[PDB]
């Protein structure tokens, strides 16, 4: 719609840096909770297979 | 200032919430307080820097 | 109330100060990259100015990182390269010194061999940093008081890890590279050699450690008390004594019967701090090489207190009484 | 006697109580209302120590030991030769320390300077107070204070430290010790700059504040300034005194187990995988 | 070695006595280094006292002052001594306070007393005056805190004596030193300096509690509006700190 | 109106590119989630 | 598309340094994760294969 | 006309052209490397 | 591929070369130290075994 | 254009040419060293 | 090749001092590693041959 | 053309020729020393 | 040959003190590691010879 | 032509000649010392 006006408030260079840092940290955190579980831990799951 | 201190106040308030919130779902006071202190420094620090 | 000069009420920031220069050409090794931090400027200077990088600074930093890596990467290998376990046990892991069976010879890598190699790089890094302090003072045409004071700290650093192990003839007498482990070594060292409280030099070094905190609280508060008379400009008060130096002197003269000058306070300050590791270095050197038991030394020299009361808890209460039953 | 510049500062007034009744100087010392009480309490405590030393049987300064009462006596008064003399000296010692701080207020008020010095001394008193009355009150007996002996009060530290099986693992001891080793480091470095700038190599002009300011910029990449070092130097020393009070007031009134066991919260966090 | 020289005097015992001798020499050296200023002792009447202390005066040391200001040998006659002090003894003997003969704040005695420093501005490494107004300074501005320029100045009794017109900074260390006060016609005539350590800055005003409204007209002035000499700095600062005790009788008299 | 000193036309141009990147980042994330659900469903 | 405009916002010197340390640190972390697993530790696997 | 780094629109495409080529070259090796290690010890 | 030479326009050759030299050696020491930790790739321990 | 370090387009070409030749020589040694190591004690 | 141009980028003083310290530190390190082992320690091998 | 350190191109070539002369002399001693040690106690 | 030009870039005053202390510490170190070994300790060997 | 230390070519040439005389003299004494101690107790 008219969401493009957000850049009249947010500095594009100041928000891109924050978005890039946030996205990677979020991705690493979700990848880490999976390994904490015993069901979705593909590293330990592969060891169980062919054993 | 009057905004950095206010943002710091939100951080310490969140840390108290984080401490009691983790104690409710188990954990312990010291275990909860450590994440509350950690949440105070990060969220409180980010707020004071992200917006002034 | 009156404004106590603990936090600056207003900060002014101008062009960055690149520092003074002379014919030694200090500027050609300077980074010329400055940044200003307002948070730290509430209590001190707000400028993170350029750093002089020469060769003693570079050599120390590179060799210091090698010691940091060798100790650190050994710790990571100790927990089987498990990062979550490395973080969890970070304060408990270490790089233990060689076993006592190897004497002064080079031990195997897994049994203190990497400790010697890592300690070699730390020794190079520390000495290189001392040379940088000595070189910078010479290039600035200033006194070598910074280098001499830092040499006093290195004296305990050398004795604790290099000189004493050679005198005992065993590399096993060094200090492990760990957060909690070098606290364990400190406690075990006192227990093994009697009671380190009764070491006269340990007692003497504590006198100068307490005096150092004593005197810097006294000097820090006195200068803040006279900062309304421009007392923080200590150097100009030495060359032209103002009312700040007079009142600071008279305050202590009326309190404890004698005082110092704006220059002489820093001679007291320098010597108490410098004597803290100098005296301790002698005490550690004599421990094991000469005495081997400090409390028995105290009993022999008649300064160990004697007690006449009983020792068991049965002489003061009962098990049922303590439990309230 | 006076100094070369002392005469113009010895003016009447500035007392907190007593006015000009005690407002005079004895030698270099300033006597006030609190200088009278300081003289009384310090002399009374000093004489009682040697009276107890006489009954102890030894006058050797290393071996003199005035000990608190037993834990059985509780918070009440004890016989003078069975621990009551220690309690009286403690009252005299507290009265002499508080009077000394209040005397410093009168002196710095007469000179028109700040009250930073008496406030800093109060932290030292607070550390002494929390060792001899505050902690014994929480633990319920006057026998938990350290004895008044040169080497006896080290034995109290040794046993109190080992009463928690490893006293280096105390989190407040960890913080408090870091402040001594740093304050001495700050004291050594600050005292070196002023000495180095004011005493250059022979035949060279003395250096100003700019030269020492740029030395640490060249040395560690940051200089705190002439005002900042004293401002942060007092804070390091005051924090050292405060955190040392914390490490001993939580050992027994707040924590009774061994200090290594305290860190079990960090080892057994839910986040750590098993 | 574990063998004693005689009795029970081993190497560890020998090192202890060596330190005792060294410390005694160190204390003697340290104390004499503190006697470079203020000695001989003198007495309340101004004559040299019969007692001078166990420590003799140290040998002369020379400071090579920069910017062509000559040398300075500290042990010797003091050029900072003041003359014609407006004080009288309250007792015929020694050890008793002096009573001012006039206005203590004007005469500069006690807490309001200054010292006869050099009548030249302090200089930085380059040689220019150290303390200058921000109007002369180039590229300097307020980066944090509350800007006090334009705020009214409220005295110790609540009177408003004027508004802050300028503020003097130490461009060498980027630190604020003084605030200029534009005195109102009802209170003063021109501009006065107050050091940053005696002023508390609020959101709408700056408060100085050591000086009442009527004491502002007598604050010492600077010879030039672009620099302040060491003597003028010492006179200005002493005046404000002298008001912490001489502003009114309630401050001088005991609080209890 | 414009706190960033950026005109309306530029902001509209900037948003269109940012949307294009956001969809591409989301499209990869969608395809990745079907792969994980097929291999090891969590519902 | 027209993603090239990111360089009108990001400074190439500052971005290139940022991803240079990020890429290696990410690579080192992943290589270390495998060394902590019994199944993917190629150093320990070779020892077992020899025996 | 918009530029916060002083870069020109025409030369921004020049910089991005080689960055993408560096991206594909770096990614191509990684895909081959991941294909090689999946054959060695698959994780699925 | 053929036009990567433009990286030297962005990067100063002086600081890149110094950084590359430190990184390359610190890399080389890392793997050499890793191999010495393993029981299978320790060439010093292997030579003793063959004795 | 687009000179951030003072180098020209023509200047940087031979600087990269020698660097790549130095890169290949360093890489060629590593391949030979790695090939010898795999024969001596294989890790696959 | 054309490697002589490396001196157009690097300061001859800086490389030589850095290389001298770097070369000695390796030589001491590798010698120490040899001393650690039981097979390449030439001091004990002479003792064992007695 | 390009000289950050200041010394000229022909000057650089003169210094490099000497540096390689020292480098090969240092390497030649190392190779002989390494060869002698391998004959003494081979590590392969 | 041509190595005499090393003095055109190294200060002889600075090199000699560095070249001087380095020789003594090296000589002291070798005399110490040689004394630690039982075979090469000439002080202990002389006592053994006298028996 | 070049001197980072302000020494002319002639001075450096004769400075090195004196330095090498000391270096060879130091090495000559060391060679005899190693030769003598190898006869006493060989380490090979
Ligand atoms: C009414 C009393 C109320 C309290 C009563 C109870 C008090 C109990 C404790 C009593 C402790 C002693 C108190 C001091 C006595 C009064 C001082 C006095 O009036 O002047 C003395 C008198 C001078 O008369 P004045 O009235 O000052 O007239 C002005 C002078 O003429 C002008 O001469 P000046 O300008 O050259 O300076 C004069 C100054 C000159 O003196 C100085 O310069 C002092 C500088 C050195 C002191 C700093 C070094 C200490 C720091 C490190 C300490 C740790 C070391 C541990 C050991 C390390 C290994 C060796 O003299 C002093 O006033 C200094 C006095 C304080 C000295 C330090 C006090 C002892 C500290 C060490 C602790 C020892 C334990 C004592 C426990 C005793 C319990 C019975 O003569 C002396 O100066 C002799 C000094 C007295 C030494 C006695 C110390 C006792 C041991
Ligand atoms: C159970 C414990 C034992 C004990 C065992 C010891 C032992 C063991 C020692 C001391 C020593 C000391 N003890 Mg004790 N001590 C005990 C009880 C006490 C008590 C007390 C209230 O009970 C106190 C106050 C002290 C106080 C002290 C100090 C007086 C003294 C330390 C000197 C110093 O400053 O070190 C400062 C010096 C160093 C830290 C070395 C500095 C290293 C170099 C200069 C820096 C290298 C930096 C490094 C490279 C990292 C840099 C990284 C940067 C990030 C870049 N001990 C009990 C009895 N004590 C020391 C001593 O004896 O002195 C004679 C000592 O060795
Ligand atoms: C911030 C904390 C640091 C600190 C600060 C500090 N201390 C201070 C001050 C300050 C800022 C002063 O202004 C004040 C001063 O004027 O010093 C010269 C002072 C002071 N701190 C002192 C000592 C002192 N400070 C110590 C340490 C510290 N104080 C900390 C490191 C120590 C330790 C821990 O070892 C000691 C022993 C004095 C020099 C002085 C206080 C003088 C005073 O109180 O005088 C009045 C009393 C007498 C003259 C005699 C009293 C005698 C008693 C009535 C009887 C005995 C009681 C006592 C318990 C005896 C115990 C003996 C055994 C333990 C051996
Ligand atoms: C004895 C009185 C006090 C004292 C004095 C003292 N210390 C001193 C001095 C003085 C006078 C100095 O001049 C000197 C100094 O430089 O001060 C700023 C110093 C100094 N003493 C220090 C600390 C220190 N002081 C201590 C104590 C004390 N020394 C007392 C408090 C202690 C203790 C408690 O033992 C310590 C640990 C240093 C801060 C400093 C000089 C040390 C130094 O810089 O050594 C050179 C080492 C390095 C540059 C590197 C060290 C290791 C790094 C952590 C590696 C880098 C890691 C990084 C994350 C890179 C990672 C790379 C990888 C990811 C690839
Ligand atoms: C865990 O680690 C373990 C496994 C333990 C491990 O060992 C890891 C080992 C690893 C990683 C090996 C890394 C080593 C490397 C990379 C070797 C680099 C070594 C090099 C490059 C050698 C150059 C030597 C040349 C010089 C230094 C001087 C030449 C001498 C001449 C004399 C110079 C002066 C000449 C002149 C002509 C004068 C100047 C002229 C004028 C002024 C005109
Ligand atoms: C399992 O769980 C745990 C363990 C937690 C885990 O692992 C979590 C991991 C997770 C979440 C991964 C997330 C990481 C991601 C997403 C990283 C992708 C990385 C990317 C995309 C970066 C590629 C960059 C390659 C380029 C681009 C090279 C280009 C190089 C060339 C050489 C440059 C070209 C040259 C120039 C430009 C010259 C300049 C030009 C001019 C001057 C004209
Ligand atoms: C376990 O221990 C392990 C680890 C195995 C170990 O040890 C590792 C050992 C390792 C790594 C060996 C390290 C290598 C070494 C040490 C080789 C360098 C040695 C060198 C280079 C010898 C210089 C000798 C020079 C002299 C001695 C005198 C000559 C100076 C003369 C006399 C100067 C004349 C003075 C003048 C002023 C000239 C006058 C002219 C004018 C003024 C114009
Ligand atoms: C169990 O729960 C646990 C696990 C606990 C938990 O916490 C659950 C997770 C939770 C709750 C997190 C909630 C997730 C959220 C909120 C997701 C936010 C994510 C978003 C919003 C994705 C944006 C993607 C945007 C991109 C990636 C654009 C790409 C940009 C492109 C590249 C364009 C860049 C610009 C240019 C190229 C040029 C522009 C300039 C000019 C045209 C001048
Ligand atoms: C836990 O980790 C474990 C599992 C242990 C692990 O191992 C994981 C390790 C991991 C992931 C690291 C992966 C390493 C990587 C990616 C590093 C690639 C390294 C690269 C790319 C660098 C090579 C090339 C550099 C040279 C060597 C150039 C030669 C330079 C030449 C010689 C210079 C010539 C220049 C001139 C002559 C200048 C001329 C001047 C003018 C013309 C003016
Ligand atoms: C993420 O990054 C990576 C990098 C991966 C990582 O892991 C991070 C690294 C991590 C976490 C390591 C954290 C380091 C820690 C906790 C170390 C604390 C250190 C402590 C407490 C020091 C104790 C006191 C030491 C003394 C007192 C020495 C005295 C000895 C000196 C040195 C004398 C010299 C000794 C010799 C033997 C001489 C030998 C010489 C010859 C033989 C010539
Ligand atoms: C018999 O075998 C059977 C049983 C059949 C079998 O095998 C069953 C298996 C089956 C069915 C498949 C199960 C596996 C699956 C599904 C694998 C998951 C697949 C995944 C995870 C896809 C990865 C792609 C992620 C990338 C590659 C992202 C790239 C991210 C980029 C890099 C974005 C970051 C870059 C930016 C620029 C953003 C920054 C922006 C600004 C700064 C603005
Ligand atoms: C800074 C505040 C300090 C507060 C100090 C004053 C409070 C002291 C409390 C004294 C209590 C007296 O009470 C005492 O209790 C103990 C326990 C009893 O002992 C049984 C005594 O018989 C009784 O005399
Ligand atoms: Fe000071």
UniProtKB/TrEMBL annotation, chains A, G, M:
Pfam families: LHC. SUPFAM superfamilies: Light-harvesting complex subunits (SSF56918). It is a single-pass type II membrane protein. The chain crosses the membrane at residues 15-35. Residues 4-43 form the Antenna complex alpha/beta subunit domain. It is found in: Cell inner membrane. The keyword Chaperone does not apply. Keywords: Antenna complex, Bacteriochlorophyll, Cell inner membrane, Cell membrane, Chlorophyll, Chromophore, Light-harvesting polypeptide, Magnesium, Membrane, Metal-binding, Transmembrane, Transmembrane helix. Its main location: membrane. GO terms for molecular function: bacteriochlorophyll binding; metal ion binding. Bacteriochlorophyll a binds at residues 27, 31, 42. GO terms for cellular component: organelle inner membrane; plasma membrane; plasma membrane light-harvesting complex. GO terms for biological process: photosynthesis, light reaction. The keyword Transmembrane applies. The core complex is formed by different alpha and beta chains, binding bacteriochlorophyll molecules, and arranged most probably in tetrameric structures disposed around the reaction center. The non-pigmented gamma chains may constitute additional components. Belongs to the antenna complex alpha subunit family. Antenna complexes are light-harvesting systems, which transfer the excitation energy to the reaction centers. This is Antenna pigment protein alpha chain. It comes from Dinoroseobacter shibae (strain DSM 16493 / NCIMB 14021 / DFL 12). The gene is pufA.
Automatic annotation (TrEMBL), chain B:
It comes from the Bacteria. Disulfide bonds join 3-52. The chain crosses the membrane at residues 5-27, 33-52. This is Uncharacterized protein. It comes from Dinoroseobacter shibae (strain DSM 16493 / NCIMB 14021 / DFL 12). The chain holds residues 8 to 59 of 239 of the full protein.
TrEMBL record, chain C:
Keywords: Bacteriochlorophyll, Chlorophyll, Chromophore, Electron transport, Iron, Magnesium, Membrane, Metal-binding, Photosynthesis, Reaction center, Transmembrane, Transmembrane helix, Transport. It comes from the Bacteria. Pfam families: Photo_RC. Its main location: membrane. Bacteriochlorophyll a 2 binds at residues 197, 202. Fe(3+) 2 binds at residues 219, 234, 266. It is found in: Cellular chromatophore membrane. Fe(3+) 1 binds at residues 219, 234. One of its GO terms (biological process) is photosynthetic electron transport in photosystem II. The keyword Iron applies. Bacteriochlorophyll a 1 binds at residue 182. One of its GO terms (cellular component) is plasma membrane light-harvesting complex. GO terms for molecular function: bacteriochlorophyll binding; metal ion binding. Reaction center is composed of four bacteriochlorophylls, two bacteriopheophytins, two ubiquinones, one iron, and highly hydrophobic polypeptide chains. Belongs to the reaction center PufL/M/PsbA/D family. The reaction center is a membrane-bound complex that mediates the initial photochemical event in the electron transfer process of photosynthesis. This is Reaction center protein M chain. It comes from Dinoroseobacter shibae (strain DSM 16493 / NCIMB 14021 / DFL 12). The lineage of its organism: Bacteria, Pseudomonadati, Pseudomonadota, Alphaproteobacteria, Rhodobacterales.
From TrEMBL, chain F:
A bacteriochlorophyll binds at residues 15, 33. The chain crosses the membrane at residues 17-39. Pfam families: LHC. GO terms for biological process: photosynthesis, light reaction. Keywords: Antenna complex, Bacteriochlorophyll, Cell inner membrane, Cell membrane, Chlorophyll, Chromophore, Light-harvesting polypeptide, Magnesium, Membrane, Metal-binding, Transmembrane, Transmembrane helix. One of its GO terms (molecular function) is bacteriochlorophyll binding. It is found in: Cell inner membrane. It comes from the Bacteria. Residues 8-43 form the Antenna complex alpha/beta subunit domain. GO terms for cellular component: plasma membrane; plasma membrane light-harvesting complex. Bacteriochlorophyll a binds at residues 33, 42. InterPro entries: Antenna_a/b, Antenna_beta_CS, Antenna_beta_dom_sf, LHB-1/5, Light-harvesting_complex. It is a single-pass type II membrane protein. Antenna complexes are light-harvesting systems, which transfer the excitation energy to the reaction centers. The core complex is formed by different alpha and beta chains, binding bacteriochlorophyll molecules, and arranged most probably in tetrameric structures disposed around the reaction center. The non-pigmented gamma chains may constitute additional components. Belongs to the antenna complex beta subunit family. This is Antenna pigment protein beta chain. It comes from Dinoroseobacter shibae (strain DSM 16493 / NCIMB 14021 / DFL 12). The lineage of its organism: Bacteria, Pseudomonadati, Pseudomonadota, Alphaproteobacteria, Rhodobacterales.
